[PDB]
Ligand binder design. Structure first.
Ligand SMILES: *[C@@H]1O[C@H](CO)[C@@H](O[C@@H]2O[C@H](CO)[C@@H](O)[C@H](O)[C@H]2NC(C)=O)[C@H](O)[C@H]1NC(C)=O
Ligand SMILES: CC(=O)N[C@@H]1[C@@H](O)[C@H](O)[C@@H](CO)O[C@H]1O
Ligand SMILES: CC(=O)N[C@@H]1[C@@H](O)[C@H](O)[C@@H](CO)O[C@H]1O
Ligand SMILES: CC(=O)N[C@@H]1[C@@H](O)[C@H](O)[C@@H](CO)O[C@H]1O
Ligand SMILES: CC(=O)N[C@@H]1[C@@H](O)[C@H](O)[C@@H](CO)O[C@H]1O
Ligand SMILES: *[C@@H]1O[C@H](CO)[C@@H](O)[C@H](O)[C@H]1NC(C)=O
Ligand SMILES: *[C@@H]1O[C@H](CO)[C@@H](O)[C@H](O)[C@H]1NC(C)=O
Ligand SMILES: *[C@@H]1O[C@H](CO)[C@@H](O)[C@H](O)[C@H]1NC(C)=O
Ligand SMILES: *[C@@H]1O[C@H](CO)[C@@H](O)[C@H](O)[C@H]1NC(C)=O
Ligand SMILES: *[C@@H]1O[C@H](CO)[C@@H](O)[C@H](O)[C@H]1NC(C)=O
Ligand SMILES: *[C@@H]1O[C@H](CO)[C@@H](O)[C@H](O)[C@H]1NC(C)=O
Lengths: 37, 49, 262, 383, 48, 48
């Protein structure tokens, strides 16, 4: 699935706002915290 | 279980860095506050899920 | 000087498929790693180009210029030398000339009286060395307007190698008062067909000429009749309005394209 | 302060425990930069407007204009012009711009007909002899010329077309003097029953009333922002500065951002570059031809973390998705929408994956989550 | 239906009154584009 | 709020510059009528 996510992340890991106003926020739980649960 | 938490600013999107367009956008009232709130409610729900 | 070179063989016109050739940068803008979609006058993919030779042969008819033209020549000794473009060609209106002589290129717009069977002439006759000697093109040019010329050089006027080493490609459009030229050079090692592959044409020059073009004809290199014509050839395709998808790579060069209506 | 901005956002004097959104921050530009192509030739408007003789409305003179400074304010600020109407620019703005190419058209027309020149009109001028395109960008400039070419018998050199088989395309020219067939009959020869010579003449005698008098028209028409510009207003260019936020203008690409040396390999014919979003991300300076990457100068969402009004007026500020090396860049020597700025004193600054958090002590304890920041970080109010 | 889809290219070319009719077109259409996107996203969020 | 709902009547009665402003009203109202239908269908699709 990251082979699809990485497309979305570069088109839209300190994510930042694009000039069109699009912003991608981080989840509250990291993939390491979901792995630990 | 979730989808990417995306927040769009309705002011930045409609009127990006124009104060002229921002002054006109205010004539429509709350629609940008309501749209930023609606997207923020979706973003909070991804953590809940 | 105008003259009729009727010492030529009579056959029908040849045809061949364009393949994916005849794509050019649609606007003067940089893009990179992008799949851009554009609507413009392109040569449709896998379309019938007509095919013409000078060899026995001197295929130099007047052809339509409807919506502009892809022209490409498989070349040796530089036999393809220029083009005449216009709406009458017999002095009653303006017309455009392009010539590459041995030294410097000339581009001119005037109310020309063109010769019916024009050419440029090179002499080898008992001199063991090719030398530029004749130009037969127009008698008169009175009300002349756009004047342009290159800085001077010398090109080669000699060559008797086997397969064609040079492909020279051009696209011409007469739109919004500008005659836009796109052109490109590639080496190739191929005998009698357009090379299958992909490469774009860059804008060569932008000419503010305004004039009506309806038809066009090509100027080739060559005791006033009877001669030797060296083996060289050119292909002609007509542009059409189409939508194209263009792969700009990491350098910002077009490396592949899709014709949306193919 | 950030707390009072949350009180104002939530419409309450008491804000509850949580993390809240506020105004986005954005480093405002320090200064303007103008970069027009460095030329000096003043444009040939003299022999456009103050010309000897003027073509007919069927044979309208076209003069191309290029490689020159066009002070359109010198035309517009004259008292002489009766009309100066413009269809994709305002006449005050013309100096602030460069154009890809320009055509001045010219003719003389009767004063009652000048209303026909405007784009997408109709009438015998607009339908059969001079049509402006329905999306025209340019200006139509008109004035009376009665005392310049009227003759007391009449200046019968001014002709116009009344008859044409079908309405002409925009900017089409028609010099034809062939005879027109109104009825069903063929009409070979110079004349006949219901056959017409398609050109008629104006009675330009200096005696006539306004509306019947001869009016001089120019149409300035021009194309925009898709080629290396050839004509510009007299706006002085300025020294090019980099890495600072500025109100740039290159050839009429007005914008706001930071300029920097790009590694982009533009080919010699390209002047602008664009992103995947098709917004212009790079420009080639028209004076000293290097490629500079237009980057939007730092901005982002701002969020305020509070334990609730009941407990404290302490708050922490999350600058969403920005490295806070760019928070000291927001020094009050230039403006931002967030007019408040005391947090910048620092000593409790913490970079997170979610952006940079100011005003909160980072600890190596992991407690239960309380106020959620993102990327595994939470905040809470404790000793 | 405005003279441009680029917002600065309107404010550069026109004045403080002729621009507003063009800016309001972009405000109207853009706002509708967000109202659409947010509706698709609210209905999507309900499915997720 | 156009002069008529019949698309070809506006094009016959008015000139090409005024008729464009009448067709702007029909396109906008119909497009809102379609967006209303598709939003209502998406809410129904979620219920089904
Ligand atoms: C070349 O041959 C053509 C005919 O094949 C000649 O063209 C004629 O020219 C005269 C005027 O000189 C016209 O009245 C004829 O109508 C033309 N014929 C055609 C079919 O167009 C031409 O004159 C010859 N030129 C030379 C230099 O020999
Ligand atoms: C340097 C040189 O030879 N220039 C010639 C020029 O004199 C001539 O007018 C033109 C037309 O053939 O061709 C070229
Ligand atoms: C744009 C234009 O005027 N094109 C004309 C065309 O209409 C005409 O048929 C042709 C020869 O008559 O000359 C050219
Ligand atoms: C800042 C700048 O580039 N100024 C140029 C100068 O360098 C050049 O010598 C002159 C003539 O071309 O035109 C101007
Ligand atoms: C820690 C603490 O005392 N919190 C107080 C709560 O007891 C009080 O009831 C409320 C209303 O004043 O404000 C808050
Ligand atoms: C090319 O044109 C000829 C007629 O001139 C036609 O017979 C032939 O089928 C065409 N080529 C293709 C690929 O259809
Ligand atoms: C031989 O070619 C040269 C080219 O400079 C020319 O000057 C000379 O007159 C030619 N002589 C003959 C006999 O062709
Ligand atoms: C064009 O050429 C003809 C013949 O010399 C002449 O009558 C006409 O006036 C010329 N036009 C110009 C603009 O010189
Ligand atoms: C252009 O792209 C190719 C393919 O990735 C690469 O080899 C080449 O180094 C690039 N050009 C430059 C100037 O780096
Ligand atoms: C026209 O000429 C007069 C001088 O004869 C001058 O005052 C006026 O400014 C000129 N107008 C233009 C548009 O050149
Ligand atoms: C947190 O732990 C790191 C070592 O993992 C240490 O360098 C740092 O000083 C500690 N900070 C505090 C506030 O204890």
């Amino acid at each position: 699935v990251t082979l699809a996510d990485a497309g979305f992340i570069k088109q839209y890991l300190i994510c930042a706002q694009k000039f069109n106003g699009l912003t991608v926020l981080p989840p509250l739980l990291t993939d390491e915290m979901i792995a630990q649960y | 279980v979730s989808m990417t938490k995306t927040s769009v600013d309705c002011t930045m999107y409609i009127c990006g860095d124009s104060t002229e367009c921002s002054n006109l956008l205010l004539q429509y009232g709350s629609f940008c506050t309501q749209l930023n709130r609606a997207l923020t409610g979706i973003a909070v729900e991804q953590d809940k899920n | 000087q105008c003259v009729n070179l009727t010492t030529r063989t009579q056959l029908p016109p040849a045809y061949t498929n364009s393949f994916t050739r005849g794509v050019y940068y649609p606007d003067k803008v940089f893009r990179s790693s992008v799949l851009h979609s554009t609507q413009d006058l392109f040569l449709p993919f896998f379309s019938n180009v007509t095919w013409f030779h000078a060899i026995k042969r001197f295929d130099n008819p007047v052809l339509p210029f409807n919506d502009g033209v892809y022209f490409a020549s498989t070349e040796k000794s530089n036999i393809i030398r220029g083009w005449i473009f216009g709406t009458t060609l017999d002095s009653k209106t303006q017309s455009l000339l392009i010539v590459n002589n041995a030294t410097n290129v000339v581009i001119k717009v005037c109310e020309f009286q063109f010769c019916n069977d024009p050419f440029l002439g090179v002499y080898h006759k008992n001199n063991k060395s090719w030398m530029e000697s004749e130009f037969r093109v127009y008698s008169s040019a009175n009300n002349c307007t756009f004047e342009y010329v290159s800085q001077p050089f010398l090109m080669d006027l000699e060559g008797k190698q086997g397969n064609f080493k040079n492909l020279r490609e051009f696209v011409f459009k007469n739109i919004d008062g500008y005659f836009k030229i796109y052109s490109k050079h590639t080496p190739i090692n191929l005998v009698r067909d357009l090379p299958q592959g992909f490469s774009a044409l860059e804008p060569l020059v932008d000419l503010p000429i305004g004039i009506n073009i309806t038809r066009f004809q090509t100027l080739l290199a060559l005791s006033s009749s009877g001669w030797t014509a060296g083996a060289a050839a050119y292909y002609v395709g007509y542009l059409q309005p189409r939508t194209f998808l263009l792969k700009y790579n990491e350098n910002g060069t077009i490396t592949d394209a899709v014709d949306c209506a193919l | 302060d950030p707390l009072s901005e949350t009180k104002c956002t939530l419409k309450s004097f008491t804000v509850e425990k949580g993390i809240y959104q506020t105004s986005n921050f954005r480093v405002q530009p320090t200064e303007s930069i103008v970069r027009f192509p460095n030329i000096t030739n003043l444009c040939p408007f003299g022999e456009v407007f103050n010309a000897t003789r003027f073509a007919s409305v069927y044979a309208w003179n076209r003069k191309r204009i290029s490689n020159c400074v066009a002070d359109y304010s010198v035309l517009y600020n004259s008292a002489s012009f009766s009309t100066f109407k413009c269809y994709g620019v305002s006449p005050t703005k013309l100096n602030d711009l460069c154009f890809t190419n320009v055509y001045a058209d010219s003719f003389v027309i009767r004063g009652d007909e000048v209303r026909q020149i405007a784009p997408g009109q109709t009438g015998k001028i607009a339908d059969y002899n001079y049509k402006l395109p329905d999306d025209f960008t340019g200006c139509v400039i008109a004035w009376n010329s009665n005392n310049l070419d009227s003759k007391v018998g009449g200046n019968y050199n001014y002709l116009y077309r009344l008859f044409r088989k079908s309405n002409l395309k925009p900017f089409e020219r028609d010099i034809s003097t062939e005879i027109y067939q109104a009825g069903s009959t063929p009409c070979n020869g110079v004349e006949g029953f219901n056959c017409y010579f398609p050109l008629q003449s104006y009675g330009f005698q200096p005696t006539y009333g306004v509306g019947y008098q001869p009016y001089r028209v120019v149409v300035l028409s021009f194309e925009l922002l898709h080629a290396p510009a050839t004509v510009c207003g007299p706006k002085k260019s300025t020294n090019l500065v980099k890495n600072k936020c500025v109100n740039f203008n290159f050839n009429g690409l007005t914008g706001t951002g930071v300029l920097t040396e790009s590694n982009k390999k533009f080919l010699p014919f390209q002047q602008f570059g664009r992103d995947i979003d098709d917004t212009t991300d790079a420009v080639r300076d028209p004076q000293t031809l290097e490629i500079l990457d237009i980057t939007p100068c730092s901005f982002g969402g701002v969020s305020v973390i509070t334990p609730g009004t009941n407990t404290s007026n302490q708050v922490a500020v999350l600058y969403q998705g920005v490295n806070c090396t760019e928070v000291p860049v927001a020094i009050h020597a230039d403006q931002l929408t967030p007019t408040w700025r005391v947090y910048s004193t620092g000593s409790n600054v913490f970079q997170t994956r979610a952006g940079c958090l100011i005003g909160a002590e980072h600890v190596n304890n992991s407690y239960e989550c309380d106020i959620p920041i993102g990327a595994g970080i939470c905040a809470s109010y404790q000793t | 239906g405005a003279i441009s889809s680029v917002l600065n290219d309107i404010l550069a070319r026109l004045d403080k009154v002729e621009a507003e009719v063009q800016i309001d077109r972009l405000i109207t259409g853009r706002l509708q584009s967000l109202q659409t996107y947010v509706t698709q996203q609210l209905i999507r969020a309900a499915e997720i």
